[PDB]
From a paper:
The O-acetylation of alginate requires the concerted action of four proteins: the putative MBOAT protein, AlgI; a protein of unknown function, AlgF; and two annotated O-acetyltransferases AlgJ and AlgX. The TMHMM server v2.0 indicates that AlgJ from P. aeruginosa PAO1 possesses a transmembrane helix from residues 12–29 that tethers the periplasmic domain to the cytoplasmic membrane; a prediction that is supported by in vivo localization studies. AlgJ exhibits acetylesterase activity that is mediated through the Ser-His-Asp catalytic triad similar to that of the SGNH hydrolase-like enzyme AlgX.
To this end, we have determined the structure of Pseudomonas putida AlgJ75–370 (PpAlgJ75–370) to 1.83 Å resolution and have functionally characterized the protein. Selenomethionine-incorporated (SeMet) protein was expressed, purified, crystallized, and the structure determined to 1.83 Å using the single-wavelength anomalous dispersion (SAD) technique. The dimer observed in the crystal structure is therefore not believed to be biologically relevant. AlgJ appears to be a circularly permuted member of SGNH hydrolases as the order of conserved residues in primary sequence (H-S-G-Y) is different than that of SGNH hydrolases (S-G-N-H).
Residue numbers in the entry: 79 to 241, 243 to 265, 279 to 370
Amino acid sequence: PGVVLGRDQWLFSDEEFKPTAGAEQLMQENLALIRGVRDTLQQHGSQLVLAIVPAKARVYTEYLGKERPASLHDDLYNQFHAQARQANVFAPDLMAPMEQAKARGQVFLRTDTHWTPMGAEVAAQALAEAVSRQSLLNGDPQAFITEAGNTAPYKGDLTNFLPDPLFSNLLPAPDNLQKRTTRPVDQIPVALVGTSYSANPHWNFLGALQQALRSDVANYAEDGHGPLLPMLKYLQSDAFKNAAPQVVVWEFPERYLPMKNDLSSFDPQWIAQLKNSR
């Protein structure tokens, strides 16, 4: 796990660049698992809304440096969407609105892998439009208010992969980060599953979803295990088994599709069920 230098003191995850051995079969395998998850949710009466997060390197190509991503990454976002469609998985396009939103300010942090709070809010709004368009939610709307607090420097997660403290003067300038918190005006109908994009309060993706959906949302995202393991954990949970939500939003950044997931802790019989759900 490493970092790639861009222009103007931008940093990227090399996971958005590196080739992966056996990437084709890994993508196949992950898609079969995603499809099995979709079918499992549907069988419990939950609608899956897959949220494919585009790579920072795809959204900010203008800050690419000398190194460019390998060919695997050229059309990964598009192929993920195409395969999700083949699998009858509902996956609203997040790339077009995030790209539109670059004119307003940064939709990703310069020195960090993650979307900015504004970037996450754009994604939440796109997802909420799609949810409304498909009538996936019923129930009385609940109103939420998001308040913007102070802005302060933020050291990005990628800076720690840089080479050594004798060279601290070479580190890129910290990002700036605006605090944003969401509160209600005053069984949960929506569950959120995903990665640090969803688990980390700094990006306020949960709050942005609550506000955009006009619905309470429960967070089952986790930091540091990729997008699949927290979803499998959720499916095995008492929360899901005893109170399946109307909608599950599954945040799944594109770079994880051709990456291996450690399934060693799961029953192979259950893994088999997921892959063979059709």
